[PDB]
């Protein structure tokens, strides 16, 4: 009856399933695999990623310029799944920094920028490379 009660239940169930190597759905599997890849990336390349992330000085007037520039660097030489994971982790750090800095309004804009870049610039490579389903076979932990 209340959509939100159903979404709370589905979120919790998806979580407990993931903790045992199971997935609510294929999309839930892709989400969890990306979360974990982001954490792995962040841990393995902390030093380098801290260095580059700290070079950024976020403002509302320049946040898009910065996003655009990093992402084009990241994908200058083409696309891998590693670069894709880093792209997400980058977006996540930009959001956290924006919040830390009282620029919450950027979070929603960053999300949009990411979704656009993914839809317009990564989706063709993704799909030619066996889709997110393959990302999950390669890098997910799940029982699959």
């Amino acid at each position: 009856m209340s959509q939100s009660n159903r979404e709370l239940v589905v979120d919790f169930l998806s979580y407990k399933l993931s903790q045992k190597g199971y997935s609510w759905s294929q999309m839930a599997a892709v989400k969890q695999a990306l979360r974990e890849a982001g954490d792995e990336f962040e841990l393995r390349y902390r030093r380098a990623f801290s260095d580059l992330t700290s070079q950024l000085h976020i403002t509302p007037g320049t946040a898009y310029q910065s996003f655009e520039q990093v992402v084009n660097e990241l994908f200058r030489d083409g696309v891998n799944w590693g670069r894709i994971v880093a792209f997400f982790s980058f977006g996540g750090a930009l959001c956290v920094e924006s919040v830390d800095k009282e620029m919450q309004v950027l979070v929603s804009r960053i999300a949009a920028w990411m979704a656009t870049y993914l839809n317009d610039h990564l989706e063709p490579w993704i799909q030619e490379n066996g889709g997110w389903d393959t990302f999950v076979e390669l890098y997910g932990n799940n029982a699959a």
């Binding site: 792995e40 990336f41 580059l52 990241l74 891998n80 880093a86 076979e137 890098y139």
Partner: peptide, 16 residues
């Protein structure tokens, strides 16, 4: 100019 480099340097543990 290191985001280029990072992109070439990153590896993930992989299921083999």
């Amino acid at each position: 100019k290191d985001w280029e480099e990072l992109g070439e340097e990153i590896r993930l543990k992989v299921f083999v």
